[PDB]
DNA sequence: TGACTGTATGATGACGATGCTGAC
DNA sequence: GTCAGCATCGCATCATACAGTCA
């Protein structure tokens, strides 16, 4: 609706749109016209197009919202055309934990069921360097790169241990432990300003570190295993994380003391993989176990700007499926999981690859191969943002452009 | 690493922001004005504008209003900076002292948030109780007032309707009330809030949800009488309040889009109106009563006033006076006339001030001065679109060349002692002396009865009673005005030569050989008083009266051969008060005393070109603050001249100069003749405040410029400017423009005033051929407004349009250059365009065009169509480097006049900035940073070098060496970055570094290498390595140079402890503020030195350069453990003053 | 002795890969 | 003699039961 002439602008300069809808043409509109869906050619004339948009920001004529909104529709375009698969490499057991290199735009790590790690370069061949795992009780459910040198992982792992460990695949030291089992952590992660550590169990207690050593952490925070743990890029102290609890629980990593005194927790109609705060920090995307994705302002942490609707689930072997932010553009790509049971538009649904607009909802795109027909969990695009890697099918993708 | 300096060397001249009150005192009317990081404060008077105070902020200025609380003498200052830090400011004056002090200061950040798309907004209720901000969606952040916080701390409300487009707070209200537009999936509305700074909260507004256009962009709360809201949008005009309800929709408005609005009356009468094409409204508020009075407000008429500059902000000020701020073009002070002229516009323009910006496309050219030429160039935008030419120093016009060659020194003379005007010049020679007079443009040669012919003349001019005076080395001879003879005439006893002459009105000194001689003027006597001997032969002399009239000079100013030495004497006894060692084996050539700005000085110049000067004290005669520069290589004449009732001081040379005060300091400008040896002052009715100057073969007549620092020339092209280049062998400059024209729906298209394009001495029209999308072109008259883009050629020397080369229908120019390419001795234009259409949003198609000119017209001899927006193009060794969307093609110049591929990259998202230093190669992408390519002569193809892995939205990119790398950034942000030189591994040597990052505050749109500072005359070897300028959005053009580290320290070290004192202004740390940020992240400054930081601590008092120095440890270049003084580092400064 | 907090258990769901058939 | 066409095989979340502590 509003919507409608708001992506059309796309803004400044405002002369197209401001019609009110136009007082409905002169309805919904009533009969025929449009229609909404139709909203699409106009969309398609009432763009000024870009290289005008270019020179407006020189002249201060438009503002960022303007230039960085449309180039991110120049980014759409050359998705559409991203069909190409450029790369893929297996291991072996299911793709679990996901890497990108914080500098390195053709370098991608990513973890196992198996406790196995691969390093992937592209413009390279010059196959992976490897580490095996035992391979039963091995699943390695996060991992993040080490800020502070970009040789070692922090990896979090159901053997019983969230450690650092050098490419070469001799650790370093060992953070948080067991020494009974029966229960392992599952979320992680670091924040290269805060060097702070922080990690999940599946009994519901985090328990975070700072890089070096003395903890104090641990006080259960839910009942339920812990599957994701968001560190917010613009904030040190804070955090937000995610349980079968159906709760997203935002933190504040140190006045937070009480056993579980909190600010603000976000219910779900069912439990949550992913936490994911935006590069901006300002938002919180929230992926739920069938079928939602949240968005949470900083606005009123409580109430999410908003929901969109998509075909995700649990499978037990299936690895959760969790929502991801591109770290330049605002966009969201979740994988898809087709049911019956779900409201969908478009039966039958080969299952892809999604990109949703934020800020808005609606999907600008969707990302498809034959003869890799697999279902997509892990999505998370280039920090670049010029490259997507999905750790799928059992093996690894990597999509770039012709 | 890498080690960059950067330094304003021209202040932004948009202006940004027009807010009316007083805040200097309650009795006196105050306008501000905000240029960016500037903030300007001016009184309005009569018919005029006057400077009260400058001053800095280190922060880019968002907010501008002044409240004024309960029991507050005036209005105090709120500013809030885009890195969101708030202030309170207050004008304080203490005798001849002004400072702008804080008194509070805060940043109110929310550590986590979304800066808002419409921007920032900041409001003020009318009791003065708050500060409103909309800084983020969904949030309105709440200042109390009350005083103390003295923090201006905050809290945040939650507000349900997410996006805001306009509040204001309400008058007439029992509790501070809110009014603002915001916009839902059921259109836009006008809703209203209490604050209730009680509570924390938000309580039910006053008024229903009104329904409202859906473009209704701007709230403007009436006063009383009357209370309410009026809501301005594309299509109507509406008041709103509780029960009434006005709309209108008047078709003038439709054409174009309200933007800005001032109050005219307290009352709020009447508002004025300003739009996107700087369309100027009058709205005026229809007052109507019904029981002994009331608020009823009638009915909305709007009226149009006529046209200015495309504004920011409007202000009325008084009798008809609006100030108008432009972002686009100059701003203005403009007059309402109460007659419409012909056209029916009640706008006259009083005043115009220069802006450079947006500065879109510039360059660097030495024409001017053919051996450096110093001249910057740049560009204004739509109605207000130009070419400006910017220069260092001062030019003079010549009226008359009369050929003398030989001629020794000039005196200015008025024979008449009722007409006060010079009719007479006098001019000297060898051994000889001939008098011209002066009647209107004629000049001849004359004789003058008293004055000799035949012995040179070392000085003359008017003298004390009614008397004319003419020193030759025979003798010193006065002489009368009215019957014309011989009055009095005195020789040195024994008939010695006179060697040296100075003289005022009553007093006359001269020397001879070590002696000499005082005499007062009397009438018919020339009277000697005491004399004496010196020690060594006197160089040069000067008897200038410091003081009022007065007209007796109580010091004598001397120069000696032997010691090389300037000394102060006291008349008539000649004691001496201070012996100055000028060293060196130089003798001094001249010496002046002067007052600039009340201050006062000693000049002395040796033949070196050197030039000493110090402060100097008329009541002891001392003299202080030894200081000394450089101008040219010659000996150097010193001549003091008036100009605007102002003292200026012109130096003679190889590098002639004007020296002048500003700020109460000294300034030294060039004046762009080739040289001048001799000069006088010259004020006749043929020629009004002029300037005699001569050489060593011509003697010249004519005016001189005002006195500034730089000097623009504007020409006006009525179209918006977007390339340019100079080229050389064609005497002239190519620009790439474009004009809108609208729909006139039957024959064709046309423009809505005359341009460049349409004026141009000769045109031509692209014919193709075809692409071909003709034949069924796809083309419609949807969006009736069309860009029309044209290669113009325009004449170094006049400026004017020589042709005009309109492109094809829908056709849009991205790239020009200037050039020869291949085997071929002709130099082509080149230009890179791209087609652009409504209904496709990246171009698919585009085309490189290479023109020769040659008298007048313009043959295309390469057309070639490839297929993509030709973003960049760049000559490279004698090839041309293109950027076509996402790629990168090295072209070659063939024997068939055809451009013919030999080199391909292909790896970019968008290539939109392209910069070459001899076979590297920069490519700047639009969301994949920094590329730096290479050109691999034995295969001829390209090799992919290096990249930047940090993701940056580039606006412009600069080589600095084959190391080194500058980006400019989206957020303001600079950042460099270099080549590992170390080589190791391939991944050290695929990453570009930041080892630079710095913001700056401005948007820069274009790099060149050059600079406007001349060769040394140092020094040499340099301070600084290289010099690239910038243009920015707001007109600001800056300088980058390189340092060595150990100079980078010194100027790091001086900034922490400057840092410490300045003060800060609304107390805002330089820390942070030069800090990399964006929404993504913040950090610290590095690779980076502000050079507007450490120039200002010549502006801070001689104890604090005291205070900054301290422990600071100096280096004079070798072996230098030592400590430094307040001195040293005042050198350094000044040395890195001169650089710009 | 309520409580909770921790251990065996077995229902339910429904994605791959690898195993091996039956058969085009 | 490659082919689809079943089949078994890999600590998730949910529901239970009756053992351990522990304010």
Redesign the interface.
């Given at each position: 609706?509003?919507?409608r002439?708001?992506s059309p602008l796309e803004?400044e300069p405002?002369?197209?749109?401001?019609?009110?809808?136009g007082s409905g043409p002169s309805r919904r509109c009533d009969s025929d016209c449009l229609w909404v869906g139709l909203a699409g050619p106009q969309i398609?004339?009432?763009?000024?197009?870009?290289?005008?948009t270019?020179?407006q920001?020189?002249?201060?004529?438009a503002?960022?919202?303007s230039?960085?909104q449309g180039?991110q529709?120049?980014?759409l375009?050359?998705l559409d055309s991203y069909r190409i698969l450029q790369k893929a490499a297996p291991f072996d057991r299911r793709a679990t934990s996901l890497a990108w290199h914080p500098?390195?735009?053709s370098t991608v790590a990513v973890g196992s069921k198996g406790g196995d790690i691969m390093l992937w370069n592209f413009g390279i061949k010059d196959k992976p360097t490897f580490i095996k795992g035992i391979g039963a009780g091995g699943s390695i459910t996060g991992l993040k790169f080490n800020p502070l040198n970009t040789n070692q992982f922090y990896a979090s792992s159901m053997e019983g241990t969230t450690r650092l460990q050098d490419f070469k695949g001799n650790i370093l030291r060992v953070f948080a432990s067991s020494d009974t089992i029966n229960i392992w952590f599952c979320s992680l992660d670091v924040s290269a300003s805060s060097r702070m550590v922080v990690t999940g169990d599946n009994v519901g207690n985090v328990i975070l570190l700072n890089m070096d050593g003395k903890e104090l952490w641990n006080l259960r925070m839910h009942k339920k295993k812990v599957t994701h743990v968001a560190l917010?890029?613009?904030?040190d102290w804070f955090l937000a994380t995610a349980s079968v609890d159906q709760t997203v629980k935002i933190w504040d990593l140190r006045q937070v003391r009480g056993k579980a005194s909190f600010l603000y927790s976000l219910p779900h109609r069912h439990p949550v993989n992913a936490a994911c705060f935006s590069?901006?920090?300002?938002?919180l995307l929230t992926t739920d176990q069938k079928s939602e994705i949240r968005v949470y302002?900083?606005?009123?942490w409580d109430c999410p700007?908003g929901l969109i609707p998509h075909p995700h689930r649990h499978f037990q072997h299936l690895t959760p499926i969790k929502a991801a932010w591109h770290?330049?553009y605002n966009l969201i790509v979740v994988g898809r999981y087709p049911d019956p049971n779900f409201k969908s538009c478009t039966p039958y649904e080969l299952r892809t690859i999604d990109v949703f607009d934020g800020n808005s909802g609606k999907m600008m795109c969707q990302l498809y191969d034959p003869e890799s027909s697999g279902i997509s969990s892990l999505n998370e695009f280039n920090?670049?943002?010029?490259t997507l890697a999905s750790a799928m099918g059992y093996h690894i993708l990597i999509w770039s452009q012709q | 690493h890498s080690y960059n300096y950067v330094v304003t060397a021209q202040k932004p001249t948009?202006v940004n922001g027009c807010v009316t009150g007083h805040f200097t005192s309650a009795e006196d009317l105050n306008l501000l004005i905000a240029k960016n990081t500037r903030l300007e404060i001016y009184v309005v008077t009569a018919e005029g504008l006057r400077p009260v105070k400058e001053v800095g902020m280190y922060g880019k200025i968002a907010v501008m209003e002044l409240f004024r609380p309960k029991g507050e003498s005036k209005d105090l200052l709120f500013i809030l900076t885009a890195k969101y830090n708030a202030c309170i400011l207050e004008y304080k004056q203490s005798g001849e002292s002004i400072d702008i002090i804080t008194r509070a200061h805060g940043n109110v950040q929310?550590?986590?948030?979304?800066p808002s798309?419409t921007?920032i907004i900041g409001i003020i209720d009318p009791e003065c109780r708050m500060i409103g901000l909309r800084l983020?969606?969904?949030?309105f952040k709440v200042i109390p007032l009350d005083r103390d916080n003295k923090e201006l701390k905050a809290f945040?409300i939650?507000?349900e309707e997410?996006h805001v487009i306009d509040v204001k707070f309400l008058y007439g209200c029992q509790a501070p009330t809110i009014c603002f537009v915001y916009?839902?999936?059921?259109?836009?509305h006008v809703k209203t809030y209490e604050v209730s700074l009680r509570e924390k909260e938000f309580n039910k507004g006053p008024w229903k949800q009104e329904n409202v256009?859906?473009?209704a962009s701007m709230v403007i709360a009436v006063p009383e009488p009357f209370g309410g809201a009026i809501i301005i949008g594309?299509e109507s005009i509406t008041y709103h309040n509780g029960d009434k309800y006005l709309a209108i929709a008047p078709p003038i408005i439709k054409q174009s889009?309200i933007v800005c609005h001032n109050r005219v009356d307290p009352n709020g009468s009447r508002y004025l109106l300003g739009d996107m094409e700087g369309r100027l409204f009058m709205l005026l508020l229809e007052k109507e009563e019904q029981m002994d009075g009331t608020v009823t407000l009638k009915d909305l008429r709007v009226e149009l006033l006529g046209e200015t500059s495309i504004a920011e902000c409007l202000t009325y000020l008084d009798n008809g006076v609006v100030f108008v701020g432009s972002?686009?073009g100059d701003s203005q002070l403009v007059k309402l006339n109460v007659d419409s002229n012909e056209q029916g516009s009640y706008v006259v323009a009083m005043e115009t001030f220069t802006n450079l910006?947006?500065i879109?496309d510039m360059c660097v050219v030495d024409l001017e001065r053919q051996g450096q030429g110093q001249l910057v160039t740049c560009s204004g935008?739509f109605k207000e679109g130009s070419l400006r030419i910017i220069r260092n120093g001062i030019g003079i016009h010549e009226h008359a060349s009369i050929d003398l060659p030989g001629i020794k020194g000039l005196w200015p003379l008025r024979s008449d002692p009722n007409r006060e005007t010079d009719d007479t010049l006098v001019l000297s020679f060898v051994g000889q002396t001939r008098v011209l007079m002066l009647n209107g443009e004629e000049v001849e040669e004359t004789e003058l009865m008293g004055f000799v012919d035949d012995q040179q003349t070392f000085f003359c001019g008017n003298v004390a009673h009614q008397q004319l005076i003419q020193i030759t080395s025979a003798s010193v001879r006065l002489v009368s005005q009215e019957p014309k003879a011989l009055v009095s005439e005195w020789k040195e006893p024994q008939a010695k030569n006179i060697s040296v002459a100075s003289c005022n009105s009553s007093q006359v000194v001269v020397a001879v050989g070590r002696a000499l001689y005082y005499l007062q003027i009397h009438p018919q006597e020339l009277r000697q008083i005491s004399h004496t001997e010196m020690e060594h032969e006197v160089a040069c002399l000067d008897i200038t009266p410091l003081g009022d009239s007065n007209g007796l000079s109580p010091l004598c100013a001397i120069g000696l051969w032997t010691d090389i030495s300037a000394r102060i004497l006291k008349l008539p006894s000649f004691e001496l008060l201070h012996k100055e060692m000028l060293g060196g084996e130089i003798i001094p050539r001249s010496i002046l005393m002067t007052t600039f700005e009340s201050s006062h000085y000693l000049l002395c110049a040796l033949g070196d070109g050197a030039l000493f000067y110090f402060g100097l004290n008329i009541e002891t005669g001392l003299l202080s603050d030894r200081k000394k520069v450089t101008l040219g290589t010659q000996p150097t004449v010193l001549r003091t001249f008036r100009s605007l009732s102002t003292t200026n001081v012109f130096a003679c040379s190889d590098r002639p100069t004007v020296i002048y005060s500003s700020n109460h300091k000294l300034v030294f400008s060039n004046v762009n003749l080739k040289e001048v040896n001799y000069m006088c002052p010259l004020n006749s009715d043929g020629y009004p405040d002029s300037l005699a100057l001569a050489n060593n073969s011509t003697l010249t007549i004519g005016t001189i410029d005002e006195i500034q620092k730089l000097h623009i020339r504007t020409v006006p092209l009525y179209e918006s400017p977007?390339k340019i280049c100079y080229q050389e062998v064609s005497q002239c400059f190519g620009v790439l423009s474009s004009r809108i024209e609208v729909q006139d729906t039957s024959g064709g298209t046309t423009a809505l005033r005359p341009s460049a394009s349409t004026q141009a001495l000769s045109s031509s029209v692209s014919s193709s051929k075809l692409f071909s999308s003709s034949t069924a072109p796809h083309e419609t008259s949807?969006?009736e407004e069309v860009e029309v883009h044209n290669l113009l050629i325009i004449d170094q020397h006049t400026f004017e349009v020589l042709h005009a080369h309109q492109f094809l229908q829908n056709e849009?120019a991205?790239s020009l250059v200037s050039c020869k390419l291949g085997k071929d001795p002709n130099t082509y234009f080149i230009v890179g365009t791209?087609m652009?259409?409504?209904?496709?949003?990246?171009?698919k198609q585009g085309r490189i065009v290479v023109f020769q000119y040659s008298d007048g017209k313009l043959q295309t001899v390469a057309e070639k169509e490839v297929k993509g927006?030709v973003?960049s193009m760049v000559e490279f060794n004698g090839k041309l480097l293109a950027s076509i969307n996402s790629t990168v093609r090295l072209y070659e110049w063939t024997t068939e006049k055809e451009l013919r591929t030999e080199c391909n990259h292909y790896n970019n998202?968008?290539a939109?900035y392209l910069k070459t230093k001899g076979d590297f190669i920069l490519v700047g992408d639009?969301?994949?940073?920094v590329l730096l390519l290479a050109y691999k002569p034995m295969e001829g193809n390209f090799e992919e070098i290096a990249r930047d892995?940090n993701?940056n939205?580039m606006?412009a990119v600069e080589i600095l060496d084959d190391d080194n790398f500058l980006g400019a950034e989206?957020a303001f942000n600079l950042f460099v970055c270099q080549k590992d030189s170390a080589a190791t591994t391939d991944?050290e040597r695929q990453?570009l570094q930041e080892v630079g990052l710095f913001h700056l505050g401005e948007?820069v749109?274009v790099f060149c290498h050059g600079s406007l500072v001349m060769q040394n005359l140092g020094e040499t070897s340099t301070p600084t390595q290289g010099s690239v300028l910038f243009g920015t959005?707001?007109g600001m053009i800056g300088l980058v140079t390189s340092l060595s580290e150990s100079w980078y320290n010194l100027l790091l070290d001086m900034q922490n402890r400057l840092n410490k004192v300045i003060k800060s202004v609304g107390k805002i740390e330089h820390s942070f503020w030069r800090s990399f940020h964006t929404?993504?992240?913040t950090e610290p400054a590095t690779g980076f030195i502000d050079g507007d930081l450490i120039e200002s601590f010549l502006d801070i008092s001689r104890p604090k350069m005291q205070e900054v120095v301290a422990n600071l440890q100096y280096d004079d270049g070798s072996g230098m453990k030592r400590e430094a003084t307040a001195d040293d580092l005042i050198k350094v400064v000044e040395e890195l003053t001169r650089i710009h």
């Open positions: 609706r509003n919507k002439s708001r803004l405002e002369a197209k749109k401001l019609c009110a809808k398609l004339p009432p763009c000024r197009s870009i290289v005008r270019l020179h920001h020189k002249l201060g004529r503002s960022w919202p230039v960085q180039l529709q120049s980014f375009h050359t500098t390195h735009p917010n890029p613009c904030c590069p901006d920090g300002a938002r302002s900083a606005s009123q700007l770290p330049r920090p670049m943002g010029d | 948009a929310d550590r986590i948030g979304r798309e921007g983020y969606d969904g949030l945040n939650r507000l997410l916009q839902d999936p059921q259109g836009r256009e859906a473009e594309q889009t972002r686009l910006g947006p879109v935008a977007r949807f969006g849009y991205l791209a652009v259409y409504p209904e496709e949003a990246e171009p927006a973003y998202i968008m939109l639009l969301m994949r940073s892995f993701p939205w606006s989206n991944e990453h948007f749109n959005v707001n929404e993504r992240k």
